[PDB]
Design a protein around this nucleic acid. Structure first.
Ligand code: MG
Ligand code: ZN
Lengths: 251, 50, 150, 1316, 50, 50, 66
RNA sequence: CGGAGAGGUA
């Protein structure tokens, strides 16, 4: 990838590959030339060391480095550890149709709903809005619907209040210790900027309102919305899975 | 000068870079000759090679 | 070290160094390397060690030893093949021929086509040929307008 | 007693202890350290002088030349501070050394001179600390925090049976140099003794014993005593020492001189020893079984054959004894070992040591330090010489030698920097002594063992690192040829000094970006004590014992102000009165207690000395004769607080606030909070945004003024006088005639920094707080900074708070806020962003910044000018174009989506050599007008000053008022007057005037060249335009706001005025907190501050009432005097009778909004005084009044608490946090969404959140959130089309981050594949 | 410590009682930080076995 | 380059449905291999899997 | 123990995505191991339905179709 | 995009 200064990034894998290819081509030429054995021997030693550093650098007591005197990132170092593929890209991964905001109380809510700012509810629910606008024919393409949502005429708010009718969103607090850490709530649109959270599910989330933040994901398909409504709504999580005691205790 | 206290002559070249010459070897020094005791130039010590 | 020896007499070679409080680390590395390889046939190993650290310079420039972002050999053979085919087909003389009969106007003031201006070395070379071979000011002006356009 | 501008508003100080030592300059450590770096030290032991004299004279290898040093001098900086920040260049001063190069002549005897050439050579640019303690390194204002590292010396620690599972304590010793290679000794669980160097492989200690030209005999004499056998005619006569037998079980008959003293098997009692000595026993016959296990000291060989019989360090047996008898040996010497008192801990090391000589010992040392390269003699010997005994590559500092000679109980606190033989031997002796049972181990967390190296020492170390490379290069250049035409300038390189210093200042772990959203945050980030950085411990590998608070932290390091989270107790902050010792250690003052009197003399004691004495408590009652009123006074003797007798104390604490920091001494009623909640109170006080209209705290601690003055945000008068001119951007002070100077009299001019941007994007502007024609004195504030108010810190507003639950709108920690708080714009804060647009130089040529941009209408270009840059004052919103930039084939800078604000400043930088567009010429043109105008106003206000002094000095001897103005104001020299000291002074003033003319001319021309010149930029950029946006963030549900006592909570509703609980007078409560936050987390300080604030506003309300209906000053004076009394024996004692009857009308004008109160932290207002103050006002003394509901209008049962609590608005807005993403960009190597708010990022549905969906049966939600919504590209394009087409359904596919895993595993030699 | 803090929070602690209070109440927060770091790993191990 | 670490005939075309030398620039020739340089003009996402 | 009882699993992905990835991959690549995707973690890895809840019916009929 | 480092919220 270019570094935007005319040069390119280091990208340690290509560095290791260039090292291996250079040593290998040199050794092939030197074997073609029938060079004496003292030279081809340390050529093969260098090639073995280079392929060694490519496959897994640092498994030798010696590790070769580039900048800043840290060893390069080999193909085995791109799988191991907290930053490998398994723990950072496969078991848990970044997600579209998601948001994050501060939480306030909103004690007028019922147990099965959560506040949701109008801005977040418009940004998360854009494709559904495009579909409903093209159903009304108010913009008979996706480009005109895009500008139409961007301007925010008075009609897209009605499109929200229809596409948010029976559509749960999954609220999630950051250390999701237990399965009551992620729960689905029907949204209630708020002219504000903070996700209001029913003050009974705070004990389940372990959420004071002293500056916490919660993420909001959207279930898309019918299977996901029914999973949210049947399994993950807050009106199903009353007993704690750890022990039969209630978890919607008045706090 | 690293263990000896001596008396020196004080000579100011260009850029105020001073040259001290010993009084034991003041014969290396001559008076001016161009008739320009007010219009005399000033060289730079050590040249301008650098 | 190779100046001594040269005959059946065993020949010693001393590398006196200053006292080690004022030698850089690279110096002791060099000295221990050159004292390690005290054998016969060590020259080529030492040369291919000097390469690989120093790195070969430009394949199509000056500056023999250094990394310094050369042009690739795989690119270079293609560039040279394009030059060979254009040259032979065209049959223009070498640039040096255009240097030979050149009435020397060495005025030691820069005169070339800059790299970023015409990046393709082959095409820039073709302009060199066609400019120095232009034998009419009208031809020079045609070169000027074509180069302005291109 | 009072000034003129403290009588504006006198904070009513409660508190009873009279202060004996005022709070020092709060930035003493930073300014003092960097002064010790850059100051001409005559004695030559601090800073640059110490470094230069530690390197120079540089003698060449040839010896026929040397380069010696004369003096050093810091030049003037090329730019001032403001131009350094704006232009993006560090604020440095060129260091110029007057080097002097001698040259010897060859054939002369040893030591002569041919020539000597000297020249002021330039070397190094050293960044200059500003007036406060902040450096400017690249335009960004940095702060180098002090570091707290273990002092160089020697330490004897022991893992408390953490290994070997036997309960065996493995005592160890570390010799830790300031600079060099460490050294360690330790004990194997077999009670051996091994050395290790630089944490390498472990070796027997006797290896390094032999390495010092010690053979085995001297080793045994060093570590062991002697027991003497004399073989005679009767069976091994031994000279017996009776104190060698204290405490052993006997083994045979103990008799002498024909009398049985002790019999076998007995323990040798003390009375047995006394019997032996009173009978004076010397010589005892002993059996032979006693010697079969004893080890002989030295070598006894056979004299005739010259063959070894017995050697050093081996046990004697019967055959050896017979041979030594047969060789004529009469005297044998064995070792006095033991089992509990003197173990043979070195003899077993000799046994296990596979080394017998010294050369081979140096051989395996060489093998250890560098594997490979098998040793020679000279290489091993030189390696071991320069490893520990070279002043080049090893150095204990003077602090190292001090602690070293202290730990070994030596005498002199001076010595050589490098180690010696006796030092290593003494360390080993002391370690063996610790092992035996005498002496005691150290704790490594003691503040007598950890020392502070602040800015000066650290930067001097880097300067020395650079100077070593400089002197090496100098030596090579001297030994090279052609000496007789060299000059020092052409000899030294100024690269490795500037590099070694810029590397430290710019990019280090201890030179960090200044927190600048307060005066408090700056002044408490400069007084920071980081326990991290180079030469210190690591954040996530620090245990529970170093994070913890030691009994020696008292007075030096604050116990409460530390961050919470992963680095707690590692980022400690200094106490108020703590200083740095001469050696870097921490010391705190103490009042000396004489025979019975607590005096007023103070002694600064360190942490080692504080343990020996006994120190009284800060608040222990003493009464006008220095005598404690009790006889069991609570003191602390040796890290143990306990009650001591009155006639035993040696010292007393200076004041009650020397335990806590500066951050946690602005908390009023700190002595009622918990420690956790006070920690959070301090750390959130550090983050309060400076609001729009600053508002004094009605309840402070009096330390507010110190923080406002010492943090350099207020513009403070350097010399007193009269304010000649006030303006919102400048203040002109005509200085008093007795504060004048004779030469360059002049008058002072202060330029106030208007709305510039702080580091944290808040707004720092100063406001004039003095009026036109008003007397000011030296040290008095003239301009409030950000969040100060008449020279005292005011971080937030103070609002009327009711403590009750309100319909659940303040459920957990939330806050319900009235709408007057948002109507009055009291939490509306200004945030100033800097958006930069750069013009690159890329393929297909550069980019211009013209207005000509495609596919956008003229509405887009309506806010740009003709040059493509937005107009100043243009109220932009999100998505508008500020700098129209084109890509050569729409790369215009746009406001980020969501943020509004007014453009207040456009800075255009251009690289030299390319022409400047229209906007750059316009900006440079107005800048030139500003620069010429400001210098002209400077010179002409100085003209007013000089001519006023000239006119006012001629009152006698030359006064003719018309003749001053018969000719114009200039020619006031050649008039008729006596040519005496008056005309002397007029000639001096005219010469000063003409010099000021010349200075103005030179400065104006230099400023013009500095403005017009092109500036250095990054290679590859053409021109940069920085637009500045000012955004008034008001307040909304979400914005976290806090108190001072650790009670945070996001505002949860902006509630109309009429719904707020009003009391019987109609006044609505401004903020309704929750009571339930008080009992659990015990910050009772908030309730007491609430009551005291209600009292203060009661006094303010009565003064306001007495002022509205106009009443004479004889009533205001009476009431205000009653208010300023009423302390129960407080130390304030202000009398209103000496006020000028109009500064009472100004005092009561400033007190009409509330009478400010100080409560020193541990010397606070007791509750009785609070009730008395609430009763001086007409408020009900229980603190709680009756509130009617806002909506139903019917009174609340159980009367509620209202008062005035000081709310800060912390810098966690909800504008910055709230974020949402539907579809956006995607990452490159793995096709997952990007991450963050700057990028249009999507939240991370991590590992725990996947287990939380596996715990439900929600498998379809999981499948979409890890294939469709994230990663499966053919799945997500189809999903988007299906959503738009009204069909919520997915085709899953398989995530591309798993195909990446296949190709990466499969790209090893590992065939991983999917089956059928 | 043998002698207690005989002063509640209605009345004020004096200096030395407050210092000993901090002795007690920083161990709590340091313990909270590192126990959190450990228990996260423990529940990760538990999830991955079952 | 021709047969370097990043390559177009070995791993695939850089731009979507386009030859290396621009001989074929539209999807109507999907699958044909150019002759001068020798890339398979196809989707550029095959550069991820080859 | 739970650290060893999870590395000693018949599924070489439910142990590779746990700790010690290099050791697990080499020991399961020499042995030529086979993962039947019969768990809740490797179905998360390979991006298909979890055999727990609403994925249980799917996996039930999928198994009974072969 | 990577690397190093600093700090902060829950
Ligand atoms: Mg919280
Ligand atoms: Zn092609």
């Amino acid at each position: 990838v270019p570094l935007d200064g005319g040069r390119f990034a280091t990208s340690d894998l290509n560095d290791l590959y260039r090292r291996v290819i250079n040593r290998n081509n040199r050794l092939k030429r030197l074997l073609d030339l029938a060079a004496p054995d003292i030279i081809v021997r340390n050529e093969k030693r260098m090639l073995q060391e280079a392929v060694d550093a490519l496959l897994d650098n640092g498994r030798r007591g010696r590790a070769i480095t580039g900048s800043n005197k840290r060893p390069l990132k080999s193909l085995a170092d791109m799988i191991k550890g907290k930053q490998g593929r398994f723990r950072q890209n496969l078991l848990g991964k970044r997600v579209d149709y998601s948001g994050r905001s501060v939480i306030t109380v909103g004690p007028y809510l019922r147990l099965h709903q959560c506040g949701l700012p109008k801005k977040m509810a418009l940004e998360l629910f854009k494709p559904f809005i495009y579909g409903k606008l093209e159903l009304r024919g108010l913009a008979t393409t996706i480009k005109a619907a895009k500008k139409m949502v961007e301007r925010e005429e008075a009609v897209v708010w009605d499109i929200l209040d229809e596409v948010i009718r029976e559509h749960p969103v999954l609220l999630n607090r950051a250390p999701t210790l237990h399965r009551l850490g992620i729960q689905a709530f029907e949204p209630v649109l708020i002219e504000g900027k903070a996700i209001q959270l029913h003050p009974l599910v705070c004990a389940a989330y372990n959420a004071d309102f002293d500056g916490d933040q919660m993420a909001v994901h959207v279930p898309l398909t019918l299977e996901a919305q029914l999973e949210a409504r049947a399994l993950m709504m807050s009106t199903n999580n009353i007993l704690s899975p750890a022990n039969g005691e209630p978890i919607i205790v008045p706090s | 000068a690293g263990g000896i206290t001596g008396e020196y002559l004080m000579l100011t070249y260009a850029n105020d870079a001073k040259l001290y010459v010993p009084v034991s070897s003041l014969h290396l020094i001559s008076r001016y000759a161009g008739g320009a005791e007010e219009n005399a130039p000033l060289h730079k010590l050590g040249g301008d090679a650098w | 070290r190779g100046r001594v020896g040269r005959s059946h007499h065993q020949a010693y070679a001393w590398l006196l160094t200053p006292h080690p409080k004022a030698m850089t680390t690279d110096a002791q590395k060099r000295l221990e390397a050159i004292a390690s390889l005290e054998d016969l046939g060590a020259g080529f190993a030492l040369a291919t060690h000097d390469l690989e650290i120093r790195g070969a310079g430009e394949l199509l420039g000056e500056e023999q030893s250094g990394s310094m972002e050369t042009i690739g050999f795989s690119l270079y053979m293609e560039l040279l093949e394009n030059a060979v085919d254009a040259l032979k087909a065209g049959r223009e003389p070498s640039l040096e021929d255009l240097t030979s009969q050149q009435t020397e106007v060495e005025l030691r003031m820069p005169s070339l086509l800059p790299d970023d201006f015409i990046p393709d070395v082959n095409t820039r070379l073709s302009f060199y040929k066609r400019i120095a071979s232009a034998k009419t000011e009208n031809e020079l002006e045609e070169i000027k307008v074509e180069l302005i356009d291109r | 007693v009072y000034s003129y501008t403290e009588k504006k508003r006198i904070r009513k100080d409660f508190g009873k202890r009279p202060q004996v030592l005022d709070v020092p300059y709060l930035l003493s450590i930073q300014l003092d350290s960097f002064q010790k770096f850059i100051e001409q030290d005559p004695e030559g032991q601090y800073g640059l002088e110490a470094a230069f004299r530690s390197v120079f004279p540089i003698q060449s290898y040839s010896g026929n030349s040397e380069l010696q040093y004369v003096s050093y001098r810091l030049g003037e900086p090329v730019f001032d501070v403001q131009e350094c920040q704006i232009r993006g260049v560090t604020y440095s001063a060129p260091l110029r050394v007057k080097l002097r190069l001698v040259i010897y002549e060859r054939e002369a005897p040893e030591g002569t001179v041919k020539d000597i050439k000297e020249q002021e050579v330039y070397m190094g640019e050293i960044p200059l600390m500003t007036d406060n303690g902040t450096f400017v390194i690249n335009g960004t204002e940095r702060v180098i925090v002090s570091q707290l590292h273990r002092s160089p010396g020697v330490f004897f620690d022991s893992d408390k049976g953490k290994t070997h599972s036997s309960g065996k304590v493995l005592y160890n010793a570390r010799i830790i140099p300031y600079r060099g290679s460490w050294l360690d000794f330790e004990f194997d669980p077999k009670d051996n003794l091994f050395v290790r160097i630089d944490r390498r492989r472990k070796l027997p200690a006797t290896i390094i014993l032999r390495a010092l030209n010690y053979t085995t005999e001297q080793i045994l004499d060093l570590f062991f005593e002697k027991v003497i056998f004399e073989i005679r005619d009767n069976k091994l006569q031994m000279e017996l020492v009776p104190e060698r037998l204290r405490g052993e079980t006997a083994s045979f008959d103990i008799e002498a001189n024909g009398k049985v003293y002790v019999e076998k098997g007995r323990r040798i009692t003390a009375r047995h020893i006394r019997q032996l000595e009173k009978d004076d026993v010397k010589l005892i016959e002993v059996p032979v079984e006693y010697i079969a296990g004893k080890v002989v000291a030295k070598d006894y060989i056979d004299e005739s054959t010259g063959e070894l019989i017995c050697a050093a360090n081996m046990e004697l047996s019967l055959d050896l004894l017979a041979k030594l008898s047969q060789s004529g040996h009469k005297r044998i010497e064995t070792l006095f070992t033991n089992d509990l008192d003197h173990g043979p801990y070195i003899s077993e090391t000799l046994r296990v040591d596979p080394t017998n000589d010294r050369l081979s010992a140096l051989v395996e040392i060489y093998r250890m330090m560098r594997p490979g390269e098998p040793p020679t003699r000279e290489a091993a010997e030189s390696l071991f010489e320069n490893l520990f005994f070279s002043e080049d590559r090893y150095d204990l500092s003077a602090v190292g030698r001090m602690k070293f000679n202290r730990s070994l109980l030596r005498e002199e606190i001076e010595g050589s920097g490098i180690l010696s033989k006796d030092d290593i031997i003494d360390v080993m002796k002391k370690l063996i002594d610790i092992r035996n049972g005498k002496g005691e181990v150290d704790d490594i967390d003691h503040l007598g063992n950890r020392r502070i190296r602040s800015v000066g020492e650290m930067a001097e170390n880097q300067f020395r690192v650079g100077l070593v490379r400089v002197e090496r290069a100098v030596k090579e250049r001297l030994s090279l040829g052609d000496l007789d035409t060299l000059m020092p300038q052409d000899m030294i390189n100024a690269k490795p000094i500037s590099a070694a210093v810029k590397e430290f200042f710019g990019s280090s772990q201890l030179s960090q970006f200044m927190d600048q959203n307060n005066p408090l945050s700056e002044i408490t980030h400069k007084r920071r004590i980081s326990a991290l950085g180079p030469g210190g411990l690591t954040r996530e590998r620090a245990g529970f014992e170093v994070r913890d608070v030691h009994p020696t932290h008292y007075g030096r390091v604050c116990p409460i102000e530390t961050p919470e989270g992963p680095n707690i107790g590692l980022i400690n902050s200094l106490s108020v009165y703590a200083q740095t010792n001469e050696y870097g250690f921490l010391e705190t003052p103490y009042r000396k207690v004489t025979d019975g009197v607590v005096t007023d003399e103070i002694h600064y004691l360190s942490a080692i000395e504080e343990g020996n004495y006994v120190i009284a408590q800060a608040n222990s009652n003493l009464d006008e004769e220095g005598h404690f009123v009790e006889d069991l006074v609570t003191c602390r003797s040796k890290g143990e607080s306990s009650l001591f007798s009155r006639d035993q104390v040696d010292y007393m604490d200076v004041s009650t606030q020397q335990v806590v920091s500066v951050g946690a001494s602005l908390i009023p009623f700190l002595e009622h909070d918990d420690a956790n909640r006070a920690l959070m109170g301090a750390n959130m006080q550090r983050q309060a945004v400076p609001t729009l209209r600053a508002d004094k705290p009605l309840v402070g601690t009096g330390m507010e003024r110190a923080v406002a003055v010492d943090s350099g945000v207020t513009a403070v008068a350097k010399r007193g006088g009269v304010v000649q001119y006030v303006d919102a951007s400048r203040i002109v002070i005509k200085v008093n005639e007795d504060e004048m100077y004779p030469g360059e009299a002049g008058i002072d001019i202060y330029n106030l920094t208007k709305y510039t941007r702080s580091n944290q994007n808040t707004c720092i502007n100063q406001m004039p707080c003095v009026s036109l024609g008003e007397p000011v004195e030296r040290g008095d504030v003239l301009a409030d900074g950000p969040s100060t108010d008449l020279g005292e810190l005011a971080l937030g507003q103070n609002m009327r708070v009711a403590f009750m639950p309100w319909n659940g709108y303040n459920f957990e920690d939330s806050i319900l806020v009235s709408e007057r708080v948002v109507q009055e714009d009291r939490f509306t804060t200004i945030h100033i962003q800097e958006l930069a647009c750069v013009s690159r130089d890329t393929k297909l040529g550069p980019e211009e910044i013209t207005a000509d941009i495609p596919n956008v209408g003229e509405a887009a270009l309506s806010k740009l000018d003709e040059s493509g840059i937005v107009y100043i004052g243009a109220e932009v919103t999100g998505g508008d174009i500020l700098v129209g930039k084109v890509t050569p084939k729409d790369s215009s800078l746009r406001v980020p989506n969501g943020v509004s604000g007014t453009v207040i400043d456009v800075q255009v930088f251009t690289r030299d050599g390319v022409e400047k567009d229209k906007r750059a010429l316009e900006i440079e043109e107005m800048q030139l007008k500003q620069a010429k105008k400001d210098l002209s106003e400077e010179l002409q206000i100085l003209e007013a000053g000089l001519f006023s002094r000239i006119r006012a000095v001629l009152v006698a001897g030359g006064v003719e008022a018309e003749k001053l103005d018969k000719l114009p104001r200039d020619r006031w020299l050649e008039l008729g007057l006596t040519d005496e000291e008056k005309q002397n002074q007029l000639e001096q003033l005219a010469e000063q005037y003409d010099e000021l003319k010349h200075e103005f001319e030179k400065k104006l021309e230099a400023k013009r060249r500095k403005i017009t010149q092109g500036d250095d930029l990054a290679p590859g950029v053409l021109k940069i335009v920085k637009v500045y946006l000012a955004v008034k963030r008001r307040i909304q549900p979400g914005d976290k706001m806090a108190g001072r006592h650790g009670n945070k909570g996001v505002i949860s509703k902006i509630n109309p005025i009429e719904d707020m609980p009003y009391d019987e007078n109609g006044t609505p409560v401004d903020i309704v907190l929750n009571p339930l936050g008080v009992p659990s987390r015990m910050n009772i300080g908030q309730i007491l501050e609430t009551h005291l604030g209600m009292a203060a506003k009661g006094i303010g309300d009565k003064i306001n009432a007495m002022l509205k209906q106009q009443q004479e000053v004889a009533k205001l004076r009476e009431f205000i005097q009653r208010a300023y009394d009423l302390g129960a024996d407080v130390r304030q004692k202000v009398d209103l009778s000496t006020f000028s009857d109009e500064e009472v009308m100004r005092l009561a004008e400033n007190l009409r909004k509330g009478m400010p109160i100080a409560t020193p932290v541990f010397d606070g207002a007791k509750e009785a005084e609070i009730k008395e103050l609430l009763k001086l006002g007409d408020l009900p003394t229980s603190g709680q009044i009756r509130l009617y509901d806002g909506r139903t209008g019917e009174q609340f049962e159980r009367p509620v608490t209202v008062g005035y609590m000081y709310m800060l608005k912390l810098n966690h807005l909800v504008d910055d946090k709230m974020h949402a993403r539907s579809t956006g960009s995607y990452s490159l190597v793995t096709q997952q969404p990007l991450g963050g708010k700057a990028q249009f990022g999507g939240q991370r549905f991590g590992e725990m959140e996947v287990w939380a969906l596996e715990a439900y049966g929600a498998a379809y939600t999981l499948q979409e959130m890890l294939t469709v919504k994230s990663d499966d590209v053919n799945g997500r394009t189809k999903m988007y089309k299906n959503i738009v087409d009204g069909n919520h359904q997915m085709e899953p596919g398989m995530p591309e981050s798993f195909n990446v895993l296949l190709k990466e595993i499969r790209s090893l030699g590992i065939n991983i594949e999917l089956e059928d | 410590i043998e002698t207690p803090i005989t002063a509640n929070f209605r009345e004020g602690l004096n200096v030395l009682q407050y210092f000993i209070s901090t002795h007690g109440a920083r161990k709590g927060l340091a313990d909270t930080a590192l126990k959190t770091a450990n228990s996260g790993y423990l529940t990760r191990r538990l999830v991955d076995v079952a | 380059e021709r047969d370097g670490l990043f390559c177009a005939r070995i791993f695939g075309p850089v731009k979507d449905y386009e030859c290396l030398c621009g001989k074929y620039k539209r999807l109507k020739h999907r699958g044909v291999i150019c002759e001068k340089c020798g890339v398979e003009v196809t989707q550029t996402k095959v550069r991820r899997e080859r | 123990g739970i650290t060893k009882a999870s590395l000693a699993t018949e599924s070489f992905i439910s142990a590779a995505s746990f700790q010690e990835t290099t050791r697990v991959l080499t020991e399961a690549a020499v042995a030529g191991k086979r993962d039947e995707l019969r768990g809740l973690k490797e179905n998360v890895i390979v991006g298909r339905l979890i055999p727990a809840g609403t994925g249980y019916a799917y996996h039930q009929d999928r198994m009974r179709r072969r």
